[PDB]
Amino acid sequence: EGTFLFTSESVGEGHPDKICDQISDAVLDAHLQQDPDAKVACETVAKTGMILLAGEITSRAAVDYQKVVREAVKHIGYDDSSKGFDYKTCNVLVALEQQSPDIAQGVHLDRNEEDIGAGDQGLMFGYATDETEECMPLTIVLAHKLNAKLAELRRNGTLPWLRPDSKTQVTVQYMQDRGAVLPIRVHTIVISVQHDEEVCLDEMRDALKEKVIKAVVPAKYLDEDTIYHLQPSGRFVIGGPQGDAGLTGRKIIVDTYGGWGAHGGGAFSGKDYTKVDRSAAYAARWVAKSLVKGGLCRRVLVQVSYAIGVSHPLSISIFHYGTSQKSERELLEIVKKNFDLRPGVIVRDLDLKKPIYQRTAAYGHFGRDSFPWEVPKKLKY
Amino acid sequence: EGTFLFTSESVGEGHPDKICDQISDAVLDAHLQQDPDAKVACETVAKTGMILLAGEITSRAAVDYQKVVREAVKHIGYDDSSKGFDYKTCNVLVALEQQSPDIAQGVHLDRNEEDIGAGDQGLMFGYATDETEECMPLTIVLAHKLNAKLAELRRNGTLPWLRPDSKTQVTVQYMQDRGAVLPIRVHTIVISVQHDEEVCLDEMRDALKEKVIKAVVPAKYLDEDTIYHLQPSGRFVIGGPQGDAGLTGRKIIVDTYGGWGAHGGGAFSGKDYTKVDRSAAYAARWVAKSLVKGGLCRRVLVQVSYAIGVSHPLSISIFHYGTSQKSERELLEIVKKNFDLRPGVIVRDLDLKKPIYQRTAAYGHFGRDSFPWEVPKKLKY
Ligand SMILES: COc1ccc(-c2cc3n[nH]c(C4CC4)c3n(-c3ccc(OC(F)F)cc3)c2=O)cc1
Ligand SMILES: COc1ccc(-c2cc3n[nH]c(C4CC4)c3n(-c3ccc(OC(F)F)cc3)c2=O)cc1
Ligand SMILES: C[S@@+](CC[C@H](N)C(=O)[O-])C[C@H]1O[C@@H](n2cnc3c(N)ncnc32)[C@H](O)[C@@H]1O
Ligand SMILES: C[S@@+](CC[C@H](N)C(=O)[O-])C[C@H]1O[C@@H](n2cnc3c(N)ncnc32)[C@H](O)[C@@H]1O
């Protein structure tokens, strides 16, 4: 009684959707390195032997798309036809046009930076939970770390049969605690990872338990009842884009909170700061994390929304799950006094012209590496 | 006190992401019309002058992709270069391969239908709320209806300056009611819609208020304080794929609950029943709606999760927001006694080999047209 299960998933750097997010952000970073004010909306599609870039970019940068794309794929680890994909020999197709002048005139042309309009309408959420130091759900943190461990053991040659495409899934049993949640145990773990033709299934399952799970998940969460689904399909030689077409912005729940909190639907990768799908979601995370680290709540959800061409948010809402002594009205007043959620101010607070976006495009955008949206603001009230 | 704001958005049939969802589902339906057991994973990408199909299909059907794609675009209304896109003259490119034999062997080959494995791992949620008869949030229902009204007035020639690409957004002020929610008033409406070169902004704004909003939103929700952002960008002549690249599965929150409830990240369109991203989300909606229509709760969230190759869900969770006299344990027991959430049983209960998918791909998958997942199951307990 008073317990429940929750499941989250994550994917590796070579999962085809994640390849697309990383390439889209490599293109964004390449532009920002030369033109901090580049307007970028770069979608990527990946299928057998193909990376296609489709979208809209208006920028003063001179970017070599062939080189940027191939370097991103090389970093991921797809460097030979035996692995199903090779940066040296794949097709890179480009269908990029300028930003629509109708959007440009309605959003940013002849506007003071602080007063630029939102680049689109939409809704966005921020979330934070005190269950981990990084203020993230344990389910998603563990799922990301399992993928990172696979990449580590692939890159260091420990498990040379590993290939870049992987997925993980973690189910945790939680105890309810006055609106907050306390992890009790890991109920189920799934790991699927692309592999070479020579390794056998038993060798893989043993290595995934001993060298991956045990190296990531604290033993205190694992018990005799924990269920393991390791290589459950039985064979995963074909992988990457060859096994499944990838697209940018198809892992938006992996990118955020693993299903916890809420999501407004917008993808992050391949977009400059004027696209509030990314900047306002980062600012909302920053607000939520600041409320938790500031001791005002233990668990909190923030919604914001925008209209294209309008700078100020249309709506702001805060839900504290019963974990604050302050009302929603009081928390909203604190947020109003401490944050300015116009995109032209978020860009300054979070330094969103800096070319750090490729680093966000795998293992989640939140709870890692002290990015600006992860450094809480000291609140005055 | 005790009130809060919530915002949801919707998009029209000609929004580029939605074009892709509709084409992906037109391809799925074309296959299912000839082969009820087709394995389909069809992604679509749209940019100026281009529809690209990328993915994996194993099927006995003989499908004319050129015809299926062009007919879907014609239905949407993109039939002339003056509108930015034309089904008669666009490029249709196909990058479709068979389903990976490694996936096929791990999921469905030599398996009894009821015992087919999930086509992938993942998590999915279902949600229902008694605030409307259709058990959907008012924010998303109104946002969808505003887009449908635009399409209606475009097609009937009432507002011949309208083009197919549109977005809407509705913010409602709600009253808290013992875990359930009661709509009070519409706080803000956004409408952006592509238009011809001849109509002026004032004519559009007047028509959007008088012929669109007033024809959809009950007057009791609108007052002197309601904020209207109508054509807020000021100009939207360039639109459809020309204005913004579209991809399948980039409107997953529009497709579901408009941000309410929760989402596991999986896209619906272009996928056959074995892909639990779609079938298990439909079954979870069916469960949630059955719990609300059965009088067991007023508002409910259901999470399920799967592992590739495994038939039974790995986890099931139910959260009733404090709106049931039964505990989560009791509701879980009722669900266990009444539903079988293996994909090979969901297919039978929800008739998921039927080619009705293109109809789901605009205006939301839930709360409309008495699809099987919208017809509550009579619960025995
Ligand atoms: C009295 O203290 C409490 C009381 C309750 C709960 C809690 C219980 C619970 N049972 N099933 C779920 C969800 C998986 C279905 C629960 N959720 C919950 C609700 C929403 C979430 O985010 C997003 F999915 F919307 C995540 C978890 C709780 O919050 C927690 C603390
Ligand atoms: C005592 O009865 C109640 C008590 C509280 C609330 C309620 C208040 C509330 N203030 N802000 C929000 C969210 C926009 C931030 C609220 N939410 C809420 C929470 C989660 C939702 O779904 C998804 F976003 F996760 C949707 C709405 C409530 O549920 C409702 C009824
Ligand atoms: C299972 S595939 C999605 C379904 C696929 N489009 C189809 O044609 O059935 C989704 C993801 O699962 C992983 N995957 C691919 N092949 C797999 C296999 N043989 N076993 C397990 N997971 C696999 C990859 O990460 C891939 O991007
Ligand atoms: C604003 S665009 C996204 C940003 C875009 N990729 C860019 O290059 O800035 C997203 C959606 O908004 C709508 N849209 C396109 N042009 C618009 C305009 N001029 N005014 C308002 N909405 C527009 C279309 O529905 C489009 O799919």
PDB file of C-alpha atoms in Angstrom, chain B residues 188-273:
ATOM      1  CA  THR B 188      -6.549  32.874 -24.362  1.00  0.00           C
ATOM      2  CA  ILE B 189      -7.007  31.664 -27.930  1.00  0.00           C
ATOM      3  CA  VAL B 190      -4.324  31.629 -30.620  1.00  0.00           C
ATOM      4  CA  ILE B 191      -5.090  30.956 -34.281  1.00  0.00           C
ATOM      5  CA  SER B 192      -2.534  31.036 -37.101  1.00  0.00           C
ATOM      6  CA  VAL B 193      -3.577  29.946 -40.579  1.00  0.00           C
ATOM      7  CA  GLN B 194      -1.955  30.090 -43.981  1.00  0.00           C
ATOM      8  CA  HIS B 195      -3.669  32.471 -46.360  1.00  0.00           C
ATOM      9  CA  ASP B 196      -3.644  33.930 -49.843  1.00  0.00           C
ATOM     10  CA  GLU B 197      -1.825  37.097 -50.987  1.00  0.00           C
ATOM     11  CA  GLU B 198      -4.971  39.174 -51.400  1.00  0.00           C
ATOM     12  CA  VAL B 199      -6.740  39.101 -48.044  1.00  0.00           C
ATOM     13  CA  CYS B 200      -5.808  41.744 -45.501  1.00  0.00           C
ATOM     14  CA  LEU B 201      -4.987  41.168 -41.885  1.00  0.00           C
ATOM     15  CA  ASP B 202      -8.052  42.959 -40.477  1.00  0.00           C
ATOM     16  CA  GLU B 203     -10.393  40.905 -42.660  1.00  0.00           C
ATOM     17  CA  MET B 204      -8.713  37.724 -41.437  1.00  0.00           C
ATOM     18  CA  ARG B 205      -8.819  38.678 -37.771  1.00  0.00           C
ATOM     19  CA  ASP B 206     -12.486  39.645 -37.977  1.00  0.00           C
ATOM     20  CA  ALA B 207     -13.382  36.364 -39.754  1.00  0.00           C
ATOM     21  CA  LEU B 208     -11.379  34.266 -37.286  1.00  0.00           C
ATOM     22  CA  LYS B 209     -13.256  35.766 -34.360  1.00  0.00           C
ATOM     23  CA  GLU B 210     -16.749  35.815 -35.888  1.00  0.00           C
ATOM     24  CA  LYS B 211     -16.846  32.790 -38.168  1.00  0.00           C
ATOM     25  CA  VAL B 212     -14.370  30.485 -36.449  1.00  0.00           C
ATOM     26  CA  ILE B 213     -14.148  31.134 -32.695  1.00  0.00           C
ATOM     27  CA  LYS B 214     -17.795  32.072 -32.227  1.00  0.00           C
ATOM     28  CA  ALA B 215     -18.860  29.051 -34.272  1.00  0.00           C
ATOM     29  CA  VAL B 216     -16.855  26.681 -32.041  1.00  0.00           C
ATOM     30  CA  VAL B 217     -16.412  28.000 -28.499  1.00  0.00           C
ATOM     31  CA  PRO B 218     -19.556  28.395 -26.370  1.00  0.00           C
ATOM     32  CA  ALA B 219     -20.168  32.044 -25.511  1.00  0.00           C
ATOM     33  CA  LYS B 220     -20.390  31.150 -21.814  1.00  0.00           C
ATOM     34  CA  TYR B 221     -16.613  30.563 -21.822  1.00  0.00           C
ATOM     35  CA  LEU B 222     -15.727  33.857 -23.513  1.00  0.00           C
ATOM     36  CA  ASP B 223     -15.717  37.189 -21.724  1.00  0.00           C
ATOM     37  CA  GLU B 224     -14.284  40.716 -21.770  1.00  0.00           C
ATOM     38  CA  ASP B 225     -10.967  39.483 -20.410  1.00  0.00           C
ATOM     39  CA  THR B 226     -10.428  36.692 -23.009  1.00  0.00           C
ATOM     40  CA  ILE B 227      -7.227  37.331 -24.971  1.00  0.00           C
ATOM     41  CA  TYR B 228      -7.174  36.711 -28.703  1.00  0.00           C
ATOM     42  CA  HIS B 229      -3.987  36.249 -30.710  1.00  0.00           C
ATOM     43  CA  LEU B 230      -5.316  35.963 -34.276  1.00  0.00           C
ATOM     44  CA  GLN B 231      -2.751  35.810 -37.061  1.00  0.00           C
ATOM     45  CA  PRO B 232      -0.187  37.028 -34.457  1.00  0.00           C
ATOM     46  CA  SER B 233       2.744  36.707 -36.876  1.00  0.00           C
ATOM     47  CA  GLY B 234       1.022  39.247 -39.145  1.00  0.00           C
ATOM     48  CA  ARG B 235       1.611  37.304 -42.387  1.00  0.00           C
ATOM     49  CA  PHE B 236       1.423  33.591 -43.233  1.00  0.00           C
ATOM     50  CA  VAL B 237       1.384  33.270 -47.033  1.00  0.00           C
ATOM     51  CA  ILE B 238       4.246  30.778 -47.202  1.00  0.00           C
ATOM     52  CA  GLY B 239       3.094  27.621 -45.458  1.00  0.00           C
ATOM     53  CA  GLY B 240       2.847  23.862 -45.598  1.00  0.00           C
ATOM     54  CA  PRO B 241       6.131  22.001 -46.188  1.00  0.00           C
ATOM     55  CA  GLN B 242       7.538  25.076 -47.928  1.00  0.00           C
ATOM     56  CA  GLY B 243       7.378  27.035 -44.672  1.00  0.00           C
ATOM     57  CA  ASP B 244       8.538  24.255 -42.336  1.00  0.00           C
ATOM     58  CA  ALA B 245       9.779  20.693 -42.815  1.00  0.00           C
ATOM     59  CA  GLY B 246       7.338  18.092 -41.526  1.00  0.00           C
ATOM     60  CA  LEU B 247       7.999  14.634 -40.138  1.00  0.00           C
ATOM     61  CA  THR B 248       5.802  11.756 -38.984  1.00  0.00           C
ATOM     62  CA  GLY B 249       5.386  11.570 -35.219  1.00  0.00           C
ATOM     63  CA  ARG B 250       6.187  15.192 -34.376  1.00  0.00           C
ATOM     64  CA  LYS B 251       2.677  16.012 -33.066  1.00  0.00           C
ATOM     65  CA  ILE B 252       2.374  13.279 -30.430  1.00  0.00           C
ATOM     66  CA  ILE B 253       0.871  15.568 -27.783  1.00  0.00           C
ATOM     67  CA  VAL B 254      -1.684  16.966 -30.273  1.00  0.00           C
ATOM     68  CA  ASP B 255      -2.484  13.325 -31.140  1.00  0.00           C
ATOM     69  CA  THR B 256      -3.254  12.411 -27.538  1.00  0.00           C
ATOM     70  CA  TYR B 257      -4.337  14.656 -24.632  1.00  0.00           C
ATOM     71  CA  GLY B 258      -2.887  18.112 -25.313  1.00  0.00           C
ATOM     72  CA  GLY B 259      -0.417  17.793 -22.469  1.00  0.00           C
ATOM     73  CA  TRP B 260      -2.835  16.377 -19.904  1.00  0.00           C
ATOM     74  CA  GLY B 261      -2.286  12.868 -18.559  1.00  0.00           C
ATOM     75  CA  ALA B 262       1.163  11.707 -19.713  1.00  0.00           C
ATOM     76  CA  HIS B 263       2.981  10.429 -22.791  1.00  0.00           C
ATOM     77  CA  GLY B 264       5.576   7.690 -23.279  1.00  0.00           C
ATOM     78  CA  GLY B 265       7.124   9.208 -26.413  1.00  0.00           C
ATOM     79  CA  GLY B 266       5.971   6.833 -29.130  1.00  0.00           C
ATOM     80  CA  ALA B 267       4.382   8.061 -32.337  1.00  0.00           C
ATOM     81  CA  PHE B 268       1.254   6.422 -33.745  1.00  0.00           C
ATOM     82  CA  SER B 269       1.121   6.963 -37.486  1.00  0.00           C
ATOM     83  CA  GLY B 270       2.549   4.557 -40.035  1.00  0.00           C
ATOM     84  CA  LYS B 271       2.617   1.573 -37.664  1.00  0.00           C
ATOM     85  CA  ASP B 272       0.721  -1.726 -37.626  1.00  0.00           C
ATOM     86  CA  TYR B 273      -0.718  -3.259 -34.426  1.00  0.00           C
TER      87      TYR B 273
END
